[PDB]
């Protein structure tokens, strides 16, 4: 049993997987078995969601996170995001579940039966962490794989039925994207937008042409990059900047996944384009604005003149100005005036909310949607009692947006920690003092006193 | 070598669980305090004393179960099982809150037993009794909060009830009624608790990160031997590190470890002193200069005036259900509320 | 060496009284700016319209506060999450009215304190130490990020960031209780176990090491003189300490390995505090404490209150009173 105790490996059981660092065969098994676990969950969780699913309640009233992802791709839904066929969901679940058996088979085989190291077996599949060119080649294969993944999304949107478009003229619907945004000024312009309010960096993406165009770019960047890394070896300045070890590379990826986790958190919290409110529920900003809209409609029906109604502080009770003058809802939702959503936008003019439109053009479907969103705000308890923290038991609800934001924050946070842990460890191991200070060569002892 | 010394021998045998003369106080008192808590939280109501369900039997969960204080009309009755209230009736005694004084009083004697145990063991093993000395802080907290505080108030009803949610209620009561956050004795408590948690984290991390390489293993715990003479980590390197990161650093390990006793122990003792004042409603509730200014100037606002508005809401909204013996009826129209909410 | 080389050598020098380092080149100026602005604003800033309702709250000493009441007040709810640097204001007077110092301070501070953490890794590397002191500091750091950045992001405004001041801190806590029932949240409960337990273990370790110091001094001198900086020999007897504590409880509940003990001292508070930070950072997205309001119902359907319902009434008091002029609509949704 090669290296499967502390004496021989130098690693205790609780650091057991570090015993795998230089055993490329068993480590391939660990990786493939784990990819199995991810695929298993995607498949099983979907079947579970589908079994529990009542197609005439909103998804977001049903604790669903995976059906909403399938529906955003335009599968299984029609106008308004109404479920028209659950069979695409069943297919996604079954096919992942079946695929996980295969991955789990390969993982178990590599992990316990196959060759422990691959280097003797094959010079193509074997690798030395310290072989910079081999590391960049494998990285290159994976980049090409990822760019093909990104182009699968583009193929779905342009050639295989489209995507769910909450912004579609006349009402949300599945729509084929025929004119994806190619202009790099628009695509890369997102990357240079501020992440602060009213701007929101990439999270502000608000139309499927930009989404599809971005993935066209990203797919080509990733395939070009992958070819690059297969054809080159790292340059001198990169050689001198990094640590070249399995543990260092892990650290870099932990750092990157952490960053992606925080971004995903903000994406599901604020973005209502690639996370349609039809499927995920209203965003926090959306539901607060929907409350102001609800009472503006109510009191205006009763006779209030909502443009000239002064609230207790002197600011408009329903309507006021943003710091740059745009007309926006009043009360605490003043903070949310950068919110944009298909049910509100028909009321917006060049100067912000239009009082003429408010007085004359508000349709019953806007009243309904604002009422629905106001009463499904993403607030709720850990035991899924919907509403404010003092609300009574009655409504079983926590928004999928809160589930997805909180889980991803927690994950991103612990991944930053793992980044620091592994990056600091990789540095120390490379320099040779990860196990402690040499008592006969204690560096501080050869340094001058501070004073 | 009479019976006293023979008993002494037996009490002091080196066994899996040491007993001692202190064990005769400690074991029964601690067992009953803990058993009384488990018994009440599992089976016993607070319907007659508080108008609350408080046990698994009634449907509470681990967060909401409690053994609750007796009714306010009991005053500071010892509430002895054989006393004039329960008159020997175990059922009625449960219904009147007898388990509350049961747990608080055996708990108090049990803590005395525990501290005697720390003294007794230190003496037998031949170490200095600083662990017992440090334990005076838990004792000052228990005694101030569970005994002195209700003794200065109307009755045991206002002591904390033994329960997770119940203790949370006790925190929020102290905010709304005593403004206890404003009290510099509580603030010193906070600094010594958070300061002690800081010291715990930073010293554990420093030792673990200035370790000498004493084995070949990448898992470094095995490279220590209890009987070894040598320090397992470098004080000199640690000292340089913090001198250069933070500006100062420990250089004396005896001082370091004494300070680790001093800080959280001192914090707890300070918070206890503030709670003794609260027994008498002797609060740090207000800054008089602030109130005089705000009364005359309706544009003057600070976070201090804002928190008193919150306190006034807590008191008006919680008192009728939290203090049922007062029979409060507050018509909707008198309840303090801001706009809309 | 050339100029650049010499500069690098000085920056990364292990011989500077305070380590500078590359993290330090960002840390030094950002922390100085945050400090200077805080000090001046705390003393002399005019009132700030925190809730965007033209109701300015006085935070500074010269405008009627003492050390306990004073604060640098969060930026205006009218601003929300918009970036409000000095040059976005038409004037300093406007910048002050709207709470611009708060943003300048918390952004320079969070950047500088993140660099403080990197700098702890950096020095440990220069000195040939193990690297994870910085991972311990990530716990208070993560908590500062939760209250000054993540909570404002979730709620949509830096006006809901923790104020920089003693009373404003309590204000943030009480309102947080009203809106999330944090006390009933298990991540805050783990936090409490982390800091109460950190204090308990701090005192415990202090008292056990102190109890077993080896006699090296007379009674007319401090026993501290019994230890000399840099001596090779341990200064207490671990075997007597364990002999003590294993009998206090029982043998196997006591640590006989100092590395194990010290790791536990690091891990217990750090992990609890990571959960505290994560409680704040997930209540930022309104996944709130347990809600057992009216959970216990009798055979007819009467509500039988529990302590959770009494908590609920205190929370209602906070909710209805906070920011008493800011709400126009019946639900407080952020």
């Amino acid at each position: 049993a090669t290296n499967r105790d502390q004496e021989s490996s130098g690693f205790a059981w609780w650091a057991g997987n570090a015993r795998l660092i230089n055993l490329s065969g068993k480590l391939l098994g660990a990786h493939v078995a784990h990819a199995g676990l991810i695929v298993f969950w995607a498949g099983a969780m979907t079947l579970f969601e589908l079994a529990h699913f009542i197609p005439e309640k909103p998804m977001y009233e049903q604790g669903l996170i995976l059906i909403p992802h399938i529906a955003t791709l335009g599968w299984g839904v029609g106008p308004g995001g109404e479920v028209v066929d659950t069979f695409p969901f069943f297919v996604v679940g079954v096919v992942h579940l079946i695929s996980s058996a295969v991955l789990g088979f390969g993982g178990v085989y590599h992990a316990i039966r196959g060759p422990e190291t691959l280097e003797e077996y094959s010079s193509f599949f074997g690798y030395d962490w310290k072989d910079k060119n081999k590391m960049t080649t494998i990285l290159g294969f994976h980049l090409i794989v990822l760019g093909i993944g990104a182009l699968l999304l583009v193929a779905k949107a342009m050639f295989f039925g489209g995507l769910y478009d909450t912004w579609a003229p006349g009402g949300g619907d599945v729509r084929v994207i025929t004119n994806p945004t190619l202009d790099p000024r628009v695509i890369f312009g997102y990357l240079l937008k501020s992440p602060f309010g009213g701007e929101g960096w990439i999270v502000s993406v608000n139309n499927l042409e930009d989404v599809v165009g971005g993935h066209i770019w990203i797919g080509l960047i990733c395939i070009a990059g992958g070819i690059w890394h297969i054809l080159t070896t790292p340059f001198g300045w990169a050689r001198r900047a990094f640590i070249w070890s399995g543990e260092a590379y892990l650290s870099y990826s932990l750092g990157a996944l952490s960053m992606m986790g925080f971004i995903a958190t903000c994406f599901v919290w604020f973005n209502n384009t690639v996370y349609p409110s039809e499927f995920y529920g209203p965003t926090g900003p959306e539901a607060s604005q929907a409350q102001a809209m609800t009472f503006l409609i109510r009191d205006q029906k009763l006779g209030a003149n909502v443009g000239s109604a002064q609230g207790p502080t002197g600011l408009g009770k329903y309507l006021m100005r943003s710091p740059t003058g745009e007309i926006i809802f009043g009360g605490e939702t003043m903070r949310f005036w950068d919110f944009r959503g298909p049910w509100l936008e028909p009321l917006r003019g060049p100067n912000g909310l239009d009082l003429n439109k408010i007085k004359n053009d508000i349709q019953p479907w806007q009243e309904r949607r604002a009422a629905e969103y106001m009463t499904h705000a993403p607030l709720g308890s850990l035991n899924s009692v919907g509403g404010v923290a003092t609300e009574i038991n009655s409504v079983n609800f926590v928004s999928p947006r809160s589930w997805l934001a909180t889980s991803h924050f927690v994950l991103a946070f612990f991944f930053l920690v793992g980044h620091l842990w592994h990056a600091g460890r990789a540095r120390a191991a490379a320099a040779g003092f990860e196990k402690g200070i040499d008592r006969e060569s204690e560096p501080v002892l050869s340094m001058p006193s501070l004073d | 070598r009479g019976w006293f010394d023979i008993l002494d021998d037996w009490l002091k045998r080196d066994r899996f669980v040491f007993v001692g003369w202190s064990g005769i106080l400690l074991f029964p008192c601690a067992y009953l305090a803990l058993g009384g808590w488990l018994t009440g939280t599992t089976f016993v109501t607070s319907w007659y004393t508080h108008g609350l369900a408080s046990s698994y039997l009634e449907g509470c969960n681990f967060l909401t179960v409690a053994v609750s204080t007796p009714a306010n009309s009991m005053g500071h009755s010892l509430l002895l099982l054989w006393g004039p209230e329960a008159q020997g009736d175990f059922t009625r005694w449960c219904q009147l809150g007898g388990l509350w004084t049961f747990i608080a009083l055996h708990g108090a004697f049990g803590l005395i037993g525990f501290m005697l145990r720390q003294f007794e063991i230190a003496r037998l093993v031949g170490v200095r009794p600083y662990n017992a000395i440090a334990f005076s802080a838990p004792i000052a907290v228990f005694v101030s909060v569970f005994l002195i505080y209700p003794l200065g108030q109307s009755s045991w009803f206002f002591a904390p009830s033994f329960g997770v949610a119940a203790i949370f209620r006790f925190l929020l009561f102290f905010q709304g009624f005593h403004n206890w956050t404003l009290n510099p004795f509580h603030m010193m408590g906070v600094a010594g608790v958070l300061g002690g948690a800081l010291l715990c984290a930073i010293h554990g991390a420093t030792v673990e990160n200035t370790l000498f390489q004493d084995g070949e293993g990448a898992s470094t715990f095995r490279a220590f031997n209890p009987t070894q003479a040598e320090e397992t980590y470098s004080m000199v390197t640690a000292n340089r590190f913090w001198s250069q990161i933070f500006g100062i650093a420990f250089s004396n390990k005896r001082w370091l470890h004494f300070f680790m006793l001093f800080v959280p122990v001192t914090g707890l003792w300070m918070s206890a002193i503030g709670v003794v004042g609260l027994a008498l409603n002797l609060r740090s509730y207000d800054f008089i200069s602030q109130e005089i200014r705000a009364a005359e100037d309706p544009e003057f606002e600070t976070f201090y005036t804002k928190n008193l508005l919150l306190n006034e809401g807590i008191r008006a909204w919680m008192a009728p259900q939290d203090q049922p013996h007062e029979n409060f009826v507050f018509p909707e129209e008198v309840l303090p509320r801001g706009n809309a909410l | 060496a050339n100029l650049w080389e010499r500069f690098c050598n000085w920056v990364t020098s292990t011989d500077n009284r305070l380590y500078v380092g590359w993290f330090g080149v960002i840390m030094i100026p950002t922390l100085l700016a945050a400090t200077i602005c805080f000090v001046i604003a705390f003393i002399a800033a005019p009132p700030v319209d925190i809730d965007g309702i033209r109701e300015p709250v006085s935070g500074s000493l010269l405008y009627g506060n003492n050390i306990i009441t004073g604060a640098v007040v969060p930026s205006s709810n009218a601003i929300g999450l918009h970036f409000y640097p000095i040059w976005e204001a038409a004037s300093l007077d406007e910048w002050l009215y709207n709470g611009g110092p708060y943003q300048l301070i918390i952004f320079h501070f969070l950047l500088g304190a993140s660099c403080y953490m990197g700098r702890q890794w950096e020095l440990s590397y220069r000195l040939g130490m193990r690297p994870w002191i910085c991972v311990a500091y990530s716990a208070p750091l993560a908590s500062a990020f939760a209250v000054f950045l993540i909570y404002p992001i979730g709620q949509g405004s830096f006006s809901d960031g923790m104020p920089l001041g003693i009373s404003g801190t309590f204000n943030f806590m009480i309102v947080f209780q009203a809106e999330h029932n944090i006390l009933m949240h298990p991540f805050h409960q783990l936090g409490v176990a982390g800091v109460f337990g950190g204090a308990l273990f701090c005192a415990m370790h202090g008292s056990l090491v102190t109890s077993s110091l080896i006699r090296e001094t007379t009674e007319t001198e401090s026993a501290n003189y019994g230890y000399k900086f840099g001596q090779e020999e341990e200064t207490y007897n671990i075997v007597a300490a364990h002999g003590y504590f294993g009998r206090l409880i029982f043998q196997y509940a006591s640590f006989n390995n100092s590395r194990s003990l010290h790791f536990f001292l690091a891990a217990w508070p750090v992990v609890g505090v990571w959960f505290a930070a994560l409680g704040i950072s997930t209540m930022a997205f309104n996944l709130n404490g347990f809600n057992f309001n009216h959970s216990v119902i009798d055979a007819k359907g009467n509500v039988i209150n529990t302590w959770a319902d009494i908590i609920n009434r205190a929370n209602l008091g906070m909710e209805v009173m906070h920011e008493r002029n800011a709400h126009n609509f019946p639900l407080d949704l952020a």
């Binding site: 006193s449 501070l450 004073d451 | 000199v236 001198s243 | 000493l61 010269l62 003492n66 900086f229």
Partner: peptide
């Protein structure tokens, strides 16, 4: 007078930090 007092105590504490760091008794291996 009160503001002066608060700022005075604060400025003393800042001075104290300066002396405690730069004018500390130096730690000596001995």
């Amino acid at each position: 007078m009160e503001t002066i007092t608060y700022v005075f105590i604060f400025a003393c504490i800042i001075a104290l930090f300066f002396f405690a760091i730069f004018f500390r008794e130096p730690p000596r291996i001995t």
